Design an enzyme around this catalytic site. Structure first.
Site, PDB file in Angstrom:
ATOM      1  N   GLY A   1       3.482   7.478   8.938  1.00 33.85           N
ATOM      2  CA  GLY A   1       4.999   7.414   8.387  1.00 33.85           C
ATOM      3  C   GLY A   1       5.499   6.267   8.725  1.00 33.85           C
ATOM      4  O   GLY A   1       6.782   5.950   8.133  1.00 33.85           O
TER       5      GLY A   1
ATOM      6  N   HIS B   1       0.798  -1.113  -0.203  1.00 34.09           N
ATOM      7  CA  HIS B   1       0.066   0.094  -0.097  1.00 34.09           C
ATOM      8  C   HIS B   1       0.768   1.365   0.052  1.00 34.09           C
ATOM      9  O   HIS B   1       0.262   2.335  -0.312  1.00 34.09           O
ATOM     10  CB  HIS B   1      -1.034  -0.087   1.257  1.00 34.09           C
ATOM     11  CG  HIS B   1      -0.514   0.143   2.476  1.00 34.09           C
ATOM     12  ND1 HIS B   1      -0.428  -0.707   3.356  1.00 34.09           N
ATOM     13  CD2 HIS B   1       0.002   1.515   2.914  1.00 34.09           C
ATOM     14  CE1 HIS B   1       0.218  -0.208   4.613  1.00 34.09           C
ATOM     15  NE2 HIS B   1       0.426   1.124   4.378  1.00 34.09           N
TER      16      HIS B   1
ATOM     17  N   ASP C   1      -0.231  -7.496   1.654  1.00 31.06           N
ATOM     18  CA  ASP C   1       0.252  -6.203   1.889  1.00 31.06           C
ATOM     19  C   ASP C   1       1.797  -6.087   1.973  1.00 31.06           C
ATOM     20  O   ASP C   1       2.113  -5.256   2.753  1.00 31.06           O
ATOM     21  CB  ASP C   1      -0.430  -5.340   3.140  1.00 31.06           C
ATOM     22  CG  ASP C   1      -0.356  -3.993   2.984  1.00 31.06           C
ATOM     23  OD1 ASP C   1       0.274  -3.236   2.159  1.00 31.06           O
ATOM     24  OD2 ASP C   1      -0.544  -3.190   4.210  1.00 31.06           O
TER      25      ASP C   1
ATOM     26  N   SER D   1       4.861   2.460   8.572  1.00 32.18           N
ATOM     27  CA  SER D   1       4.555   1.229   8.006  1.00 32.18           C
ATOM     28  C   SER D   1       5.663   0.638   7.391  1.00 32.18           C
ATOM     29  O   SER D   1       6.490   1.341   6.861  1.00 32.18           O
ATOM     30  CB  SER D   1       3.233   1.094   7.318  1.00 32.18           C
ATOM     31  OG  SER D   1       2.991   2.404   6.024  1.00 32.18           O
TER      32      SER D   1
END
Ligand SMILES: Cn1cc(CC(=O)O)c2ccccc21
Ligand SMILES: Cn1cc(CC(=O)O)c2ccccc21
Lengths: 642, 645
Positions: free
Chosen positions: A148, A68, A92, A150
């Site tokens: 900020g 993502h 993801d 991930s």
């Protein structure tokens, strides 16, 4: 652009601190070139796309982060950009082979429950394991704190990797827990094949199988392969998201393969008793879904589509096919999740310049590029289509606009034409063009959990994704040479859609297909639980709860919102209903609220406001039991990306 | 960097006004030209699409000058063909800057017809009809979301003829819907062009025959608050000198007697002395406490550090401007080294050094070498108490003599005499008067912003921000005081100086009620005086709105109010009012954060949803929006709030 390493978090009882390494012009040059000649250090990286900034963790000599964030992007490397070694849209997760200089974390062995999240600011945050992939913040914090961060590690006290951070679980904006990609999912991903082949269609198995078919449009995935299957004795169902395409399949089959099939669209139905049916997703839904024992194969063609009817249609197929006698389901598309736009042999790709008589999206079209022959221009809005179409008609160019609401027959079948169209074209109209000129933008809808009082559906103009780009350009080069002209080279990542689309599903369930919120949940969960499909935050409980409490709609208001062809006919009609009964005026006197115009003299006082669907110009009251119900729904745990 | 022209709007030559845009620079080209200040592209068109390394907006050429908003462009140069163009005009009050336009730049000219049918040209070349309603206002013909008007400030309002009425600077909202537009009229731009480019405010003014307001833009350490009070008093005048800081107030007083031979009057919380001298040093706080201007006492009033945007300084200067003529003063001097619009220039004493990644000590993505701080006296600016504690602990470990200092600590912790590294928030520059061998700056600070968020009412968000030209200069100037000094930094950048948030206005109403016994109406008068006096920090006029909020906040619990006042945190009045509502409801507070400590003893008795009035931080408990007072503040949100675009 490539992903760019712009700095790093250094790790020691666990402690951390940051180092910046690149600036703005450093990030943006290296993004355009893909050549990062700067030496990589440590196991956590601070990374950047010109859009966004996040973290990346090295485990097992693979530098890992979130799909993502990274999408299918290259990472800027010493000897040029790095193709991704791994891509798992379902998990993801993405991965590049680790640059030289980079160290790795070792995976977590001994089963620790006491965990530590490393943030982009280099704070180390106590987390208690709860699932395979969930930990709960020892002290809750604003969701903003975690943004900020991930791709960042979750460490056990040994300093080994438990997994990487991907999402925040939220109560009315406050992060209570964390969602993470577990270190075991990286090992499965590392074990899975480099490239799996789905070009060739499956063989009808002994037991039920969900299969995938990745092949170009008009290879025969929706013509040769159904016929092939029927030749073997099978009854097959072909689902497509376009009326025009569904219809056209009938006349091509009876010419190409001697099968005069059954055609099922809203507008027209043909029952021939053939072993091949072509149906739309909506007509399949309106029909009841899977007709007991009617079909052996279901082919869900164009399964990359993320409109409510496709997601709901596919979900229904996956929930029903096995019980309803099917042996094979499939999922067919030329643009799966994680795909990118690559050169096509039949298509010349030419960027626009500022040289041109016709202004287009800050660039210009020369009149000579479109003067004769047939050309298609994608605009993002109805307003642009009309403006452009008017200009060219003044210049003497045979020009026509097409968008939602207009009839197809505005587009001439045979002469010189410039067709100025929104994406609506790509369900109304089958034909191909000499050139395609693309603004490279579209209009999308975002849910905002705004607590003012409840939620908002925003309408925004965004960069096109890789699916849009390819579907658009695929309007030229169809077994003949085409040009593609474009404003910007860019593409945002394919295969993700917004929570608003889940809202659209419950709405359409209720408005069109006489589906309960519970039955919609059943169908969507199947779509969600199946790998290889587009992805979405799981907010099924949330939307089900919202629609579950929306009872005794006015059917007349429903009819009118459905007739008009508004998005959210059900959400709009239910506000209308609530206003009527409260004897209070609508949020504003926009066309959305047309249906109340007859009660305009009697309605007075503040709006019993349920949720925001556009502009609110009246005073509001938060007293309606229904507003109160939805406000209570907002307390649900919602998974939000960081 | 510089402002860069990235594109243009092209307006129809004939018939109905219609526009299209051209894009002339992409993103990388924009970033390079920001750094070089060199742009050899020809300026075509009248309306220009401009970008900084942060925001984008519009610039219009009128009468040879390329005009844009101060709130977009700050004091930045404009990338030109012979390198960067300095601003010819900077008007922080009008929110208007101007660069001389490149030669043969297509320019507009004012409209001579005096028509009331107007047209706004937006950043994506939509021509929007506006109806003229004032000199600087017009109303939209159909209301639109204010998000639609964003990045369109600096664009023109045009008469049907195609000439310039004004430049767009802000939208008037009711609850996120834009109903009207505020612009700078074209005569305010000709006022300017007819007037001198250069002004001098470097000298203390002569005392006028009758009441006047004057600016003193002079360095700290030209004695603006020592030398100039003394010379005014030697001429035989009565002088009052106001300063934000009690350490500075006492410090100037003790120097005045030492040097200039007057034992002055001193007025602070901590120490008050009446000598009968014609010179009084007071804080702004102590002045407000005293009930402001007492008639006939002073001929001159020096409002020093008039750049300070704390609630007490604004309230103070507001009071002096509202009252001084009537109290028979002849002169008000608004004294500062860093006036609105100012920019950091080199200093002769201060060597400036950009921190690298080479050092033992991590600092804000960079590194301090121990060599730099191992001996002597050093000051380390940090945005938070967390970082101060964190770094003093690292430096204590590295065996450096390191004291942390912030709001809530005793200036006594810092040694006057020895080897030291003090690790401070900006609380330093009001609590402590000393200088240092080097200054290290993180180049960020913590600020408050209001957001009218309607969830139910408003948010005061607390955020970490790039410092401004004011911060940099005050921080840097804590070294190089009449000797050499070293200023070490994380960022070359500074934001534009001389603008503050609507949250500060909220803070002024709050201080009024909590400290100085002002009715909201009494505060609006004081603040209006500030707002209509030019040359001071500017702010969106949200006076009516803030006044309306506080006017309904009646019958506070006095105890809670004294507990929030003592504790020294921001918004003591909005906190003690939220707790009052909570306690009297037996409802728990929004969170159990340090904010709500005055309710801790009642924790077992507190049950149910919080009756939520506004957001001053994280809300963790369930809320109810039923309280009579929530409803009252919800109703206030319908006021016409002007917001920048
Ligand atoms: C919402 N919706 C879309 C379609 C597709 C179509 O027109 O075939 C449809 C069909 C029947 C009933 C409802 C329908
Ligand atoms: C809030 N506040 C600040 C000051 C400044 C000072 O201490 O001199 C002050 C003085 C008296 C009463 C209240 C005060």
């Amino acid at each position: 652009g490539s992903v760019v390493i712009v700095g790093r978090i250094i790790l020691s009882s666990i402690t951390a601190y940051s180092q910046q390494t690149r600036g703005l012009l450093g990030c943006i040059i290296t993004s355009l070139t893909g050549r990062d000649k700067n030496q990589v250090e440590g196991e956590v990286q601070v990374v950047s796309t010109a859009t966004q900034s996040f973290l990346a963790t090295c485990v097992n000599g693979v530098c890992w982060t979130v799909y993502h964030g990274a999408g299918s992007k290259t990472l800027a490397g010493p000897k040029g950009p790095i193709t991704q070694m791994y891509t798992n849209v379902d998990q993801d997760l993405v991965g590049w082979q680790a640059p030289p200089g980079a160290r790795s974390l070792t995976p977590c062995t001994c089963g620790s429950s006491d965990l530590y999240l490393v943030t982009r600011h280099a704070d180390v945050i106590p987390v208690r394991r709860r699932g395979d992939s969930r930990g709960s913040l020892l002290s809750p914090r604003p969701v903003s704190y975690l943004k900020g961060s991930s791709g960042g590690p979750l460490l056990c006290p040994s300093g080994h990797a438990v997994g990487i951070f991907r999402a925040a679980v939220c109560t009315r904006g406050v992060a209570k827990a964390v969602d993470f990609v577990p270190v075991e999912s990286m090992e499965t991903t590392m074990r899975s094949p480099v490239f799996t082949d789905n070009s060739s269609p499956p063989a009808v198995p002994q037991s039920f199988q969900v299969a995938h078919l990745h092949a170009p449009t008009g290879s025969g995935k929706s013509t040769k392969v159904p016929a092939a299957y029927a030749a073997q004795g099978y009854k097959v169902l072909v689902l497509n998201p376009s009326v025009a395409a569904t219809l056209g399949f009938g006349a091509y089959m009876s010419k190409a393969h001697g099968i005069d099939p059954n055609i099922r669209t809203g507008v027209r139905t043909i029952t021939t008793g053939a072993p091949v049916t072509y149906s739309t997703y909506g007509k399949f839904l309106a029909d009841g879904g899977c007709s007991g024992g009617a079909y052996d194969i279901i082919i869900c063609d164009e399964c990359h589509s993320t409109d409510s009817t496709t997601i709901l249609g596919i979900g229904t197929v996956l929930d029903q096919a096995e019980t309803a006698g099917a042996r094979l389901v499939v999922l067919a598309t030329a643009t799966p999740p994680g795909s990118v736009t690559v050169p096509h042999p039949n298509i010349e790709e030419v960027a626009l310049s500022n040289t041109g008589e016709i202004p287009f999206y800050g660039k210009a079209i020369p009149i000579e590029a479109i003067r004769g022959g047939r050309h298609l221009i994608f605009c993002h809005s109805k307003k642009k289509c009309d403006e452009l179409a008017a200009k060219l008609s003044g210049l003497g160019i045979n020009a026509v606009a097409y968008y939602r609401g207009l009839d197809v027959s505005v587009i001439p079948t045979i002469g010189d034409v410039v067709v100025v169209a929104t994406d609506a074209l790509m369900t109304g109209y089958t034909g191909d063009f000499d050139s395609v000129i693309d603004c490279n933008t579209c209009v999308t809808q975002t849910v905002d959990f705004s607590l003012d009082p409840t939620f908002t559906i925003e309408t925004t103009t965004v960069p096109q994704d890789a699916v849009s780009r390819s579907q658009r350009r695929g309007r030229t080069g169809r077994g003949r040479r085409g040009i593609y002209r474009f404003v910007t080279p860019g593409e945002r990542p394919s295969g993700m859609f917004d929570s608003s689309v889940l809202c659209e599903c419950y709405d359409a369930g209720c408005a069109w297909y006489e589906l309960t919120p519970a039955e919609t949940s059943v169908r969507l969960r199947a779509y969600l639980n199946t790998p290889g499909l587009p992805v979405c935050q799981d907010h099924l409980e949330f939307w089900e709860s919202v629609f579950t409490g929306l009872t005794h709609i006015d059917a007349h208001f429903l009819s009118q919102t459905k007739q008009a062809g508004d998005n959210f006919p059900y959400l709009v009609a239910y506000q209308a209903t609530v206003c009527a009964r409260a004897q209070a005026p609508p949020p504003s006197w926009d066309q959305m609220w047309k249906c109340l115009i007859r009660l305009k003299p009697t309605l007075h006082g503040p709006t019993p406001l349920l949720y925001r669907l556009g502009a609110v110009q009246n005073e509001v009251t938060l007293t309606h039991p229904i507003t109160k119900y939805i406000m209570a729904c907002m307390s649900a745990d919602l998974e939000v990306v960081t």
